[PDB]
Structures are given as structure tokens and as C-alpha cells.
């Protein structure tokens, strides 16, 4: 029944409402909001609350204020998500289905109403602060906690909409308050009216115009508050490389669409944080990474008005690929792979422009801008390749050549780029030593895994697909198709891959024990690198490397040689590198 047609009927109560009714109603509305935030529609989850349809009809101040707060939170969330545009076709449904979503009342008025309801309930709590009295006090505590949480969440969502990012620094403290509050909303959860089609809710309201359990609500909201607190700290960064690393780290956790959209909108259509210009950020990243002579204050190229109007054009050309790269990082972990594969054409164009600009600058008096663009492009390709491991898109028999591409070719180019960048940095004079070390560990892990897979295939422990029209050549060409749009580094075709990956160069050709020992030596180098440098990623890499080494050393001694069972590869320990168990 519709709210307008039910107010006269008497099935719903708009005034003189009991505390347990409010506790249950607020809990159910919170669950509906969380369900909507998980990627579902509005007419099915949030608008099932008959009260939210027209909150002007509610006479109880508390319920009306709660409805206004929920509507305003939905407004801010929808606006931010639409602005960011980092949600897939089915990861969020932003259509409002023609609902008047509390646009008449201001947001500050809603916050004031929430504060008034909270104060006029803390007074009641203090009036009994010392069985029926105890139950009333507990219900009052529950209502006050829910109201205060609504107010603080709406306040943070409001503060995230200010033009200046500094307002976010005025909201982080509020999040701490939520830590001492959500548990309260969790503690007095058995006071609300349990569902049985609860009172005040009609899930079949919307049928001609077209949830989660309460126990999981508190933990989800706590995780979301932690995500927002993590997002808030992004305003302290000053270099594009650090922001890129921050975005990658944030996306590694698979955050909700609201968190990704909030981060995207707080980062940037033209000004970063509302303070820095993206052209200047690009120039600063160039100066901090490769230090080209043009960007040095006293290198005579800054004073030239034509080298300046050649570096600025390149910076303006590089500004859009980077915005697109950040946006691609903002998406979920499914479309990220395809968008990474597609950004390669734009970055190849950028690389060609960088090469031309560097050549012209040297001729007018090498490989500084080209080195920087190559570093970013190599990062893109490596992340694209590893994403398939993250998404279980590779079969068992595809591991060896994917890992060979990652280790022997891509990571070698990455090390050459990093070493040349550090050399140019020294020549113009260790922010990349940690990155070099991490790349060393990653490359050794990948090389060990590649040798492992090659030995497994030689031993016959890997199942291949036997059917007349399936060839490795076409599979290899299609797997590495996005790499055709790049020119430097050159794509490695199937024939060259078989030539370099062949084991007939070494006389005598290596057998399974030799390759197993080589993989063990790679894992040992990875361990000796990682365990000498730490954060969570280093611990995950070490936990994925240490048992791997002992497993391969044990297996190189002839254990389970006659068996043909395919070994299991557990990706629980680390996202990209598996722990190969023999059981």
C-alpha cells in the first residue's frame, strides 16, 4: 500500500512512536541503505521505507529527521558517484525513478534537526542515568546512538562536497567518534522490532514503476568508516607517483563504489585538490624522477622561451593519459584489465611524442622523458599481466609463458629503466631504491615460478588441452594482443618466445632437477632480498616465497617424480604468486 493511501488507512504510525519501533525502523533503513550501496536499485531497497516517500507527513521529530538524513545521504552519495563515473553498468544503479529526494530542505537544516533530536534524547538519557527504567534507558541509548551515527555520516558526506579539500581534514576527527559509537549501535541491536514484512515497510511498493541481515550491518559500517578515513589521508601527498601508488593500494583492497568515487572526486575536471594544477604536478614528477635539463632552474633551458613552449606542450599532452590512468584505477578489478590494455595506445602516442621532444631538445642543446614514459608504460603492462592472475583468467598451461614474459622481458626492461633513471638523477645532482628492491623481489619470484612451470611441463605434471584445432600460437598471439599497440619495448612474438625460452642452447639440456634447483635459487634470492629490507606487502611476498623454496628444494630431490597428479596452486597467500603444494 502507498504511503499516502495508508496514512488514512491506519496501517502505519506517523506520530507517538515507541522507542523499539524507532530502533527497528532505523536498523531496517540502515540495512536497506547498505544494500543499495552494494550495487542494487533504489525502488527495491531504499524506497521500500514508506516513510521516506514523503517525510513531511511524519509528525514524530525523530523519524522525520532520520528520513531526511537518509534522503540527504542518498543525494550526496548519488551526486558523488555520478561525478566520479568509476562504476560499471552493473555495479551501481543511480536512477532515482522520479522520486523527490529531499531537495526542498537544505543539508545544514537536516544536520541541525539531527543535532536537536540528539540533544533532546541525551537529555532523556541523563534524566534516567543511574527493570522498566533500565529498558527505557537502554532504548534511549540505542536511539541516540543511531541518530548520532546518522548525523556524523551525513556530516562527513557533506564535508566531502566542499570545494576545498581542507574541509576533509575537518571531518577525519569525526570518524574517530564513530569508532566509539558503532559498537553501541551493535550492542543494543536486540531492542528493535524484528521482522515478521515489518511494520512501516512495503517491499512491493514499486511494481508498476519498474537485503543484508542486521548482524552484518555494524561490521560493514565500521569497515566503510575505515575506508573513508583511509581516503581522507590522500590530501597529504604532493607527487603524482605517490598518488598513483596510493590509488593502486586502495584498489588492491577492492573498496566499495562509494569509497572509490569519493577518492576520485577528492583527487581531481582540471585542478588537483583544488590547489595544484595537473601540469605543475606532471612537471614536478618529471623533475623528481628523471630531472631533465629543461626543468632544472639553472640549466639555461628554463630561460629559453621556445624550449619552455616545447616542454609545456608535452606536459599538456601527458595530462589526459594520466587522468585516464587514475580513472581506470578507480574502476573495479574486472574492467581494470581491459582498460589497462586499452590505455596502451594512448601511452604509446605519449611515448612517441616524448621521444620526439627529447630528440629536439638534445639537438637544440637524451631519453629522459622517454625513460619516464617507458617506466609508466612498463608499470601498466606489468599490472595488466598480473591482473589475469588476480582474476584467475590464466589456465595451468599458460603460467609458464606469462611468467617468462613478466620476468625475463618486462621486468628486465623495468630494471633498465629504473637504473637509467637513477643514473640521470645522480648526474643532475634514494626514492627509487625501495622500488628497485621490490621489483627485484618480484622478478625473482616470477623467474622462479617460470622455471617451476617449465620443469613441471617437462615432467608431465601439467595437463594440456588435446583437441585438433587448438594451437599455442594463436593463444599466445591473443593473450599478448594489447602489447601490439606499443613500440618500445617491442612485442615478443611466438617464434622469438620459443627461440629465447628454448633449453637447447645450454649443453647439456637441463633436466627437471636442474630447473628445480634454479627455481630454488631464485626463491632464495627473493627471500634474501625481501627479508633484509617492512609493510604488509613485503610480509605477503615473504610468506609466498619462503615455503615455495623449501617445497622446490624437497621436490628437486626426486620426491613424487613418478606421480603425474597436477600440483595445486594456492593464491590465498599472495594475489599474484601461488604457493605450489604437492598434496
Amino acid at each position: 500500500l502507498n504511503f499516502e493511501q495508508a496514512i488514512k488507512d491506519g496501517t502505519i504510525k506517523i506520530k507517538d512512536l515507541t522507542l523499539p519501533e524507532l530502533i527497528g525502523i532505523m536498523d531496517t533503513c540502515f540495512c536497506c541503505l547498505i544494500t543499495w550501496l552494494e550495487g542494487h536499485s533504489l525502488a527495491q531497497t531504499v524506497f521500500t521505507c514508506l516513510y521516506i516517500h514523503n517525510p513531511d507527513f511524519i509528525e514524530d521529530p525523530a523519524m522525520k529527521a532520520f528520513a531526511l538524513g537518509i534522503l540527504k545521504i542518498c543525494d550526496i552519495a548519488r551526486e558523488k558517484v555520478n561525478k566520479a563515473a568509476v562504476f560499471e553498468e552493473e555495479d551501481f544503479q543511480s536512477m532515482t525513478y522520479g522520486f523527490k529526494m529531499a531537495n526542498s530542505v537544505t543539508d545544514l537544516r537536516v544536520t541541525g534537526m539531527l543535532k536537536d533530536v540528539e540533544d533532546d534524547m541525551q537529555r532523556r538519557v541523563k534524566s534516567t542515568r543511574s527493570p522498566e527504567v533500565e529498558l527505557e534507558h537502554q532504548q534511549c541509548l540505542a536511539v541516540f546512538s543511531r541518530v548520532k551515527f546518522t548525523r556524523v555520516l551525513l556530516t562527513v558526506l557533506i564535508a566531502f562536497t566542499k570545494k576545498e579539500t581542507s574541509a576533509v581534514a575537518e571531518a577525519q576527527k569525526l570518524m574517530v567518534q564513530a569508532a566509539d559509537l558503532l559498537s553501541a549501535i551493535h550492542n543494543s541491536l536486540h531492542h528493535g522490532i524484528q521482522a515478521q514484512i515489518m511494520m512501516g515497510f512495503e517491499p512491493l511498493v514499486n511494481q508498476r514503476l519498474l537485503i543484508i541481515k542486521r548482524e552484518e550491518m555494524v561490521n560493514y559500517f565500521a569497515r566503510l568508516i575505515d575506508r573513508i578515513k583511509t581516503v581522507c589521508e590522500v590530501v597529504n601527498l604532493t607527487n603524482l607517483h605517490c598518488i598513483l601508488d596510493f590509488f593502486c593500494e586502495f584498489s588492491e583492497q577492492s573498496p566499495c563504489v562509494l569509497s572509490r568515487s569519493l577518492l576520485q572526486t577528492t583527487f581531481l575536471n582540471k585542478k588537483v585538490f583544488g590547489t595544484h594544477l595537473m601540469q605543475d604536478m606532471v612537471k614536478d614528477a618529471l623533475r623528481s624522477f628523471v630531472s631533465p635539463p629543461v626543468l632544472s632552474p639553472k640549466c639555461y633551458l628554463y630561460n629559453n622561451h621556445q624550449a619552455k613552449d616545447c616542454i609545456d606542450s608535452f606536459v599538456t599532452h601527458c595530462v589526459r593519459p594520466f587522468c585516464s590512468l587514475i580513472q581506470i584505477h578507480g574502476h573495479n578489478r574486472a574492467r581494470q584489465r581491459d582498460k589497462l590494455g586499452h590505455i596502451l595506445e594512448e601511452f604509446a602516442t605519449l611515448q612517441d611524442e616524448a621521444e620526439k621532444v627529447d630528440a629536439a631538445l638534445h639537438t637544440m642543446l637524451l631519453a629522459c622523458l622517454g625513460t619516464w614514459v617507458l617506466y609508466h608504460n612498463l608499470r601498466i603492462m606489468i599490472q595488466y599481466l598480473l591482473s589475469g592472475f588476480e582474476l584467475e583468467l590464466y589456465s595451468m598451461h599458460e603460467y609458464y609463458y606469462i611468467y617468462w614474459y613478466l620476468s625475463e622481458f618486462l621486468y628486465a626492461w623495468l630494471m633498465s629503466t629504473l637504473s637509467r633513471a637513477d643514473g640521470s638523477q645522480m648526474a643532475e645532482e634514494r626514492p627509487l631504491s625501495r622500488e628497485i628492491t621490490m621489483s627485484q623481489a618480484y622478478q625473482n619470484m616470477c623467474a622462479g615460478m617460470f622455471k617451476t612451470m617449465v620443469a613441471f611441463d617437462m615432467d608431465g605434471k601439467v595437463r594440456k588441452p588435446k583437441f585438433e584445432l587448438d594451437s599455442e600460437q594463436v593463444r599466445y598471439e591473443h593473450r599478448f594482443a594489447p602489447f601490439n599497440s606499443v613500440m618500445t619495448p617491442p612485442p615478443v612474438h611466438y617464434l622469438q618466445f620459443k627461440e629465447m625460452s628454448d633449453l637447447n642452447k645450454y649443453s647439456p639440456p637441463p633436466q627437471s632437477p636442474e630447473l628445480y634447483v634454479a627455481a630454488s635459487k631464485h626463491f632464495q634470492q627473493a627471500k634474501m632480498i625481501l627479508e633484509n629490507i617492512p609493510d604488509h606487502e613485503v610480509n605477503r611476498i615473504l610468506k609466498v616465497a619462503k615455503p615455495n623454496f623449501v617445497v622446490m628444494k624437497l621436490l628437486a630431490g626426486g620426491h613424487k617424480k613418478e606421480s603425474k597428479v597436477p600440483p595445486e596452486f594456492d593464491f590465498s597467500a599472495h594475489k599474484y604468486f601461488p604457493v605450489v603444494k604437492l598434496v
Partner: protein, 145 residues
């Protein structure tokens, strides 16, 4: 117990086809359209005087083929009926000058994934909550050229 593989040339088997689809996993017009436009790709596995398995595919313009439905009776699984049925559809697609055979599946269907991997199919994309149930889906394609 002799099993047989037969193409689609009659008007008696669509009622048998739907019985083998709704009991395994759509509107009747979906199957009607798919049989209409591409009758040369719909194959059935009949044992005796009944139908044991079925496959319905479409090939539309690179010329890409698509496998829409592949079902086997519960009492007749694990006998290799599905693998042969998929082979005699891939071969028909090849005779029709197709370049790639694409399909979608549930990530939970481990048996189907292993079957298509044995047939040579390689995962290309992973979709989140693609199915109406809520489970994530996997897109498997086989490239022929």
C-alpha cells in the same frame, strides 16, 4: 545403451529441447529465435526414442560464434556426451567460416569449466554479479585464426 547425435531438421523437437533446458539451469521466444536464425548449429543427443542432451548456438557478425545453451540429463552426465556435442558444434562453426567461439558460464560450474578447458577454451574476461542469481561469471573463448 547406444547414444546418437542428430542435427536440427524437423518440427517436433523444440518441446523436447525446452524440457532439457528448464530442468538444468529463459523465455520460449529466446529458444524459438535461436533455432529460427541458426538451425544448422542446434544439435541434440538422442538415446533410443528420447533426447539425452542438447546444444543451441548462434553465429553472428570478425565473424564470432556463440554457444548459448549446453545441457545434459542428470542420469547421463560424465559419459562424454557434452564434449562430443561441443565438438560437433565447433566443427559446424568452422565449416561456416568462424573466427572465434565465445561463451559465458558461472564461476561455480567447475565441471563445465574443466570440460571447456579440456576442449581448449581459454578464459578472457571475468564479470562481477553478471548472473541474476548474483554469482560472478567467466567468459571463455576459443580462437581459431
Amino acid at each position: 545403451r547406444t547414444i546418437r547425435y542428430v542435427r536440427y531438421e524437423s518440427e517436433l523437437q523444440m518441446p523436447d529441447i525446452m524440457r532439457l533446458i528448464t530442468k538444468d539451469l529463459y523465455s520460449i521466444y529466446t529458444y524459438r529465435y535461436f533455432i529460427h536464425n541458426w538451425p544448422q548449429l542446434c544439435f541434440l543427443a538422442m538415446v533410443g526414442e528420447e533426447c539425452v542432451g542438447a546444444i543451441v548456438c548462434k553465429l553472428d557478425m570478425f565473424r564470432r560464434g556463440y554457444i548459448a545453451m549446453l545441457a545434459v540429463d542428470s542420469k547421463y552426465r560424465r559419459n562424454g556426451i557434452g564434449t562430443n556435442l561441443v565438438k560437433k558444434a565447433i566443427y559446424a562453426m568452422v565449416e561456416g567460416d568462424c573466427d572465434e567461439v565465445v561463451l559465458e558460464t558461472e564461476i561455480t560450474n567447475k565441471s563445465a569449466l574443466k570440460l571447456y578447458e579440456n576442449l581448449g577454451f581459454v578464459r578472457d574476461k571475468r564479470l562481477f554479479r553478471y548472473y541474476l542469481n548474483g554469482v560472478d561469471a567467466l567468459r571463455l573463448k576459443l580462437w581459431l585464426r
